[PDB]
Amino acid sequence: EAMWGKALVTYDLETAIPSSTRQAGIIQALQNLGLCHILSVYLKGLDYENKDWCPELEELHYQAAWRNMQWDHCGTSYHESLYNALQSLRDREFSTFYESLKYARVKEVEEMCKRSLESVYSLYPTLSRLQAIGELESIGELFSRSVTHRQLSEVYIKWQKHSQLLKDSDFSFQEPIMALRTVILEILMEKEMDNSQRECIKDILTKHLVELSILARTFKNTQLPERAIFQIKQYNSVSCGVSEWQLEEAQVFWAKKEQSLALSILKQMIKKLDASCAANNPSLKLTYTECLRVCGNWLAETCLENPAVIMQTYLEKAVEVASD
Amino acid sequence: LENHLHVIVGTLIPLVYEQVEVQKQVLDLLKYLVIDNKDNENLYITIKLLDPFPDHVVFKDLRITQQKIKYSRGPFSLLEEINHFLSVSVYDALPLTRLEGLKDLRRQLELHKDQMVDIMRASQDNPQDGIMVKLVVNLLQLSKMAINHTGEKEVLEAVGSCLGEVGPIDFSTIAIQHSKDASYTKALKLFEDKELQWTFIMLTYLNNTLVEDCVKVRSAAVTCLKNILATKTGHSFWEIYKMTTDPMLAYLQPFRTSRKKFLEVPRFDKENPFEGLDDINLWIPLSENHDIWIKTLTCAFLDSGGTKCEILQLLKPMCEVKTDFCQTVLPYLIHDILLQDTNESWRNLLSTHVQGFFTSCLRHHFFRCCLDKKSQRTMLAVVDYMRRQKRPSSGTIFNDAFWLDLNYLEVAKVAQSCAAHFTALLYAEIYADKKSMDDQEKISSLSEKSKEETGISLQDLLLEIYRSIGEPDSLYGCGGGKMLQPITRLRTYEHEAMWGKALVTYDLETAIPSSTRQAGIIQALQNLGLCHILSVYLKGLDYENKDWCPELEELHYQAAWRNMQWDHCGTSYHESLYNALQSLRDREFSTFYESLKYARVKEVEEMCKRSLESVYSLYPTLSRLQAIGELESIGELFSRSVTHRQLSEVYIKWQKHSQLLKDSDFSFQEPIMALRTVILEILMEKEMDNSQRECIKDILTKHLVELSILARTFKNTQLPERAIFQIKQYNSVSCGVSEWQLEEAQVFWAKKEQSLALSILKQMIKKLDASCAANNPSLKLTYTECLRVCGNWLAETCLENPAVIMQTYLEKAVEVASD
Amino acid sequence: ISMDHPHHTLFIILALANANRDEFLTKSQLDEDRTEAANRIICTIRSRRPQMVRSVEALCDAYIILANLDATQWKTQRKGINIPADQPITKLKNLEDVVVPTMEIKVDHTGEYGNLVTIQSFKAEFRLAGGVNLPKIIDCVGSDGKERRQLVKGRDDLRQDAVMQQVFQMCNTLLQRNTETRKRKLTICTYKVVPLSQRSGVLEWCTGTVPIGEFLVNNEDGAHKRYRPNDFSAFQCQKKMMEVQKKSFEEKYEVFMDVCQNFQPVFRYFCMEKFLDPAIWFEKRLAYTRSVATSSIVGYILGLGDRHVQNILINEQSAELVHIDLGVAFEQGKILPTPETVPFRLTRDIVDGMGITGVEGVFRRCCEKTMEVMRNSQETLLTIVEVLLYDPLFDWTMNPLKALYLQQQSFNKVAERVLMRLQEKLKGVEEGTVLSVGGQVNLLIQQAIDPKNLSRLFPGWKAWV
Ligand SMILES: COc1cc2ncc3c(c2cc1-c1cn(C)nc1C)n(-c1c(F)cncc1OC)c(=O)n3C
Ligand SMILES: [Zn+2]
Asked: Would you list the DSSP string of B149-206?
């Protein structure tokens, strides 16, 4: 049921559970709740009891290492191969990167094939992992040659089309792909060394994080949207004061059942948009219209404002303010 | 001799211990004073309201006579003892003399808690005059006078041991009320004229300072009395005051003399006034020149400037020697000066210089900066006095506020810095009203305007003022652009106790200062029941870290003692508690008692340091002291032989004390219930007997059930499950039916798993039905409650048709079923 | 019940038996059945307690005779007028058996009731403080050395006030039970009402209180005159609002906003002037805000109406609000001409008195806490109100005579309609949409503070005040 807080409480409480399963559940629940630094420190602490060190612990350590981008934690398994591939991608040694991806594909398909294959649900994790490896191989040649605006834009186009393909798939399969995508974008920002297309990479990363926040909200998950908003706050210096991702931040606050903060954010955005321009800019048309409409609907639902003010200030203004 | 008796007794009592030769004369004098003169009407009341003598071989006779005198006409009840304590507290004496009264108050408090139940119920109608708040604040003042004196340590230990007995009881009040003399207010009400009130105040202060040890202040004080009594105003004061009965009336009688010509003060006028007070250096002091600064300012007021009142220009000799008199007299000086103002020159000059002073306090070295807190308090007292007086224009109270042109935002900020929270809030309200008034004549807008010109945001200032006051509801009232900041979100989170959100935000945000970040993470983990995760997190924090700042050590020690992890090895509260539990484990009771005493003294001293304006500041220390008291009480039980009965009454005392803590916040309730279960588990771990192990197990089971119920009441779900898990660990149930299993079902219901609770409870009902036909008297209550709860739950969730629910569950409970 | 607890129940039975005694002293089958049964009950009580019944009857007769006395001659004087000698109230002396009617009696499970304060004498001076029918203020000297001030009203029905007070007491008990409200000391101020007949009664006089209208908009020494002297006088505001009554709604709105712009709230200075110590000022302001919140929520639940300036009292010592004249309730004010469109009075003065935060701070939270307590006890409240409304003598349904007086079997259907409306209020179902406690509180606040709703109100309600 994805009630990971209850899972953490019960895993911590019960000691009769066999150890390996206990730390596996604890690490998974901490990871899926967005507790990144807490997970890293927890992993560091468990290293004291190094007497028993079973494969699940290496696997979870490497998953945390590549997810949290520590970059220092040093047959090969899945997340080990992904971490090494990202190592090589930063190091610009593409040969070992390609070989690691090849070995990961071969091992994963071997493990999937050895099974009985009676139910369709068993296929999904293997398919998700293979898709992730494929996208890594796809960015390989992009990073290898000279990076261009149109190549990166078209890669994002394939990513969004493939995400549209997985619309009905469960969050458990979609989330690792998005995590790998955001790691890719952060790496590309880090090792680019040019200003001009850096804003392009930043814009694509912001779009990806907004999409991730929307996806997590559709699954009634609240922590990951907040992490995405935070990570956007770091990569974006708020100077203009109005942007599309701020509306998504306001939507995420409302989902977290903190209506006052969302309303304050949206009202501040409306005031800044009204002051900055008279809606002549085509770029800010949709953002201003959506901010006004969402604020009006939220005020109508929560009943802080009388119908006359809601109609005149927000809804009618949204209609009159407003290429598919 | 009724007036000075207590001073003589308090002086003579300590000297008995020093040496036998003087002890003989001291004892003879005390015996003649008390035992010989018990059969005297005048001294009976004074002997009754006297500090009990120390319990020693020396004082058996005196103690017996005093006890017999005091309890004549009947013994005292709990309430009475408290009233007697405050009544003898009316007498002023050194704190060392009150040690025996403190001990007797402690004993009377611990003997009866059911009576404090009645006092708490009675004081419900008027919470302000409840005796519990008065007793707590009285002990706190007695502690403040104890600091920097010979017997501070013994006094503080007794005060803390008394305060631990009451605990953090809900007093239903918000603001601490400092004590005020009843006769003082009546005396001020007596004189209608403003100058006569000044006469009474100054003469009372001089009479009080006449007795102080230093000879210099007496030499000036007697001259001040001679001069004041000589004038016309003194004669009017005497004729209007002679009607009442007061010892100062008899004291000042020989000083007053009858002369045909009243003393006339020299009404000399300088060629040009305002010259002395024009200097900026006069108004703005340096860092450590407050004593000279106040004297210089006061005498500059006295130096040929205004002072129409004949009282003034006679107070200079007393002002020169003593500074306390200087800050006492300054507001009266300024009021007199402004009363006679013509063309508003004084008003403008004083307004400008007061603005300069107040800006200099908020400038934060600098040419004028870091003004000592005493000077700021003096000027705040001046403003407070000026606000109350009525202006000569016969205007209104809002006009009365503006005796001087003041920007009340700066004054409010200074008052907040000086911990006058209510004064700061009132001044902020006045400033906002004035700003709106001048705006109309010509909170976000006011806040941004204040930030633009004054540099202080109004909404932010109200934020820390309401935060210092501590009232929970008022926090959500303040709002602006500041909720977007992660820090405000986090504090709103822990205030509402949404610990998961606070933990997530603490992990996410990195701009937060590190120490606050780890402190919040540890606190959230502790309140979430994630003890093992917290321990491993702390262990991992050791690597790649420098020496911990003290908060990390404090939190680590709290985790160690709460988790019963005894391997790890000035002292703070949790350090002392951990060492005390270790010493109790190691039977080193001497170090245990020493550490408990040190912790009590430290907690009382820390409460003594702060300004004590809001009652909410008192609650954490009350909780800590109650925990220390319960630990010390269990110490004597463990040291000697332990019996089943003693366990019984100590647990009964625990329920009584918890009953006193019914309305207290969970934040204050949880530490006591954690320490109780830790202590009980220690008793389990080192009891070493089959017979009493079951008794300790039963006590622990009942305590854990009560903890689960308390946590469910405050809508906390993690802690009840941990308590149920501990009950599982200590009580393997072969019978399959027990009372705590019903509580487990309730806990599972509270966490929104209806199927889980329903399955457990139906299994319990089936086992109970199979086991017996409800003939067992102990199982009748549990069986009936299980049947009733099952019927109600199935009715609520509609998992069963009404006929089956009625016939099988609800009617069954009635059929099955001395208080 | 009467034998076990005579002091609580004897006055009610006498009032039932003495419904028509006013006309007798001056000079439907159910009614005479009730009178005969009350006579039988009083006969039994006198059989066990003769002196108590005789003394209570004499006291009730004296009260009624005092009520019908005409005070038009002394309407102007406020210092106090001596009681006429022919009044039997003065002759009464040393009434040991009778307890003071305008006093709360702590109910004793044991029936001795040994030590109670009893009437000793009545002061010879009665004071007039205004009113529509000139109620008289009299002082009762008890057995101990204390003075109890009582209010004697005539030509008015006080039973409705008494039963409203009982419902308020039940709501106070419900609030006291809950820990969250008990911590905040949220209570409804209450007073003892003792109806003596259909048109006469006696009730407690709340000492130390002043009407908010008298404090705010008094013409000679009102707050709006001492403060903000350049603004509109209350007379001009009332005249403009009366002039715009016949005009259209948009004209009403324009005139109302014009008045409000030039008439600013000054109620914040009450606590500021009466309490100079900042700690006491803060405590009294908090108590005022909490009292306003609990009164507003309880009034909305019971549909309290006609909450104009002269129907609310504020205690000078405690700064708490007391509501009087509870005749109109259960949303019957909306059936009036020019109907009331606000759940409760939350005009600019009351909001300003709360503080700079207004309703954003303590007021809103106290409203949600009270509303949550109301929700958790919806069934008990429903049963209490259902018992109350079907009282044959309760008389809550609005009739044209009261409609004209306020502004100078269908019973079963209207009753069940009121029950369903109250049930919807309690569950939070508003305008057909289920609402959380916070949402319902927000809706109520916005409806109360909306200038659009305030403009359409009767000028007698004094919305601008
Ligand atoms: C319990 O009943 C009361 C108690 C009062 N206690 C104090 C007080 C009152 C009181 C009025 C009533 C009352 C109730 N009903 C149905 N009618 C009246 C009248 N008045 C008051 C007023 F507010 C309005 N009109 C007249 C008033 O006095 C005559 C006032 O000025 N003070 C200080
Ligand atoms: Zn400095």
From this structure: STTHHHHHHHHHHHHHHH-S------B------HHHHHHHHH--SHHHHHHHHHHHHH
Give the neighbours of chain A: at least 3 Cβ pairs within 8 Å.
Answer: B, C
Closest CA to B708 of B742, B734, B682, B679: B742
Instruction: Tell how strand C209-211 and strand C193-195 pair up.
Output: unpaired
* Contact call for residues B541 and B565 (beta carbons, < 8 A): no
Q: Taking the CA atoms of chain B, what radius of gyration do you get in angstroms?
A: 33
CA C456, CA C439: separation in Å to the nearest integer?
25
Chain B positions touching C185 (Cβ under 8 A) are 127, 172
Residues in A closer than 8 angstroms to B504, CB to CB, are 33-35, 223, 226
Residue B340 backbone dihedrals phi, psi, to 5 degrees: -95, 15
Which phi and psi (to 5°) does residue C395 adopt? 60, 65
**SS3 of residue C151 by DSSP:** strand
Residue C301 DSSP one-character state:
H
Do B386 and B400 contact (CB within 8 A), yes or no?
no
Contact partners of B by the rule of 3+ C-beta pairs under 8 A?
Answer: A, C
Interface probe, candidates A9, A232, A264, A266, chain B, greatest B C-beta count within 10 A: A9
- Which residues of C fall within a CB distance of 8 Å from A304? 442, 446
Going from the C-alpha of B725 to that of each of A13, A253, B406, B718, B782, the distances in angstroms are 7, 35, 63, 11, 20
Phi/psi region, residue C104 (left: phi>0; alpha: psi -120 to 50; beta: rest), is beta
**Sequence-distant (≥ 6) Cβ neighbours of residue B383 within 8 angstroms:** B406, B411
| Residue C154 β-bridge partners | C200
Tokens at B378, concatenated: 């003096």
Neighbours of A110 (CB within 10 A): 9
What's the rounded Cα separation, in Å, for the pair C139 and C152? 10
Alpha-carbon distance of B665 to B168, in angstroms, equals 9
What is the spatial distance between Cα C350 and Cα B305, in angstroms, rounded to a whole number? 47
Give chain C's end-to-end CA distance (angstroms, integer). 47
Are the C-beta atoms of residues B556 and B523 closer than 8 Å to each other?
A: no
Residues within 6 Å of ligand 1 by CB: C 129-131, 135, 151, 161, 191, 203-206, 209-211, 310, 313, 324-325
Amino acid type, B225: L
Count each helix (H run) and each strand (E run) in chain C, helices first: 20, 12
Neighbouring C-beta atoms of residue B9, cutoff 10 Å:
22
Contact A27, A143 (CB under 8 A): no
Q: CB-based contacts of B612: which residues, under 8 Å, 6+ apart?
A: B137, B140, B176, B618
Q: Which residue has the tokens 């610990």?
A: B499
Closest of A143, A146, A151, A147 to residue A92, by C-alpha: A143
Cα→Cα distances B221→B230, B336, C370, Å = 14, 22, 60
Interchain contact B426–C (C-beta under 8 A): yes
Q: Cα(B638)–Cα(B586) distance, rounded to whole angstroms?
A: 12
Instruction: Report d(CA A68, CA A33) in Å as an integer.
Output: 13
Residues of A in contact with B722 (CB under 8 A): 13
Closest Cα to atom 28 of ligand 1: C129
Q: What's the token pair of residue C339?
A: 């109907």
Residue type, B105: L
CB A32 within 8 A of CB A4: yes
Q: From CA C428, how far away is CA A259, in angstroms rounded?
A: 19
Mutate to test the pocket of ligand 1, among C190, C212, C313, C406 (most ligand atoms within 8 A of CB): C313
Given a contact cutoff of 8 angstroms between Cβ atoms, the answer to whether B483 and A261 are in contact is: yes
Which token pair is C46?
């006198």
The answer to whether residues C121 and C93 touch, using CB atoms and an 8 Å cutoff, is yes
Report which bound ligand comes closest to the CA of B366. Answer: 2
Q: Which residue among A302, A306, A308 places its CB closest to the CB of C439?
A: A302
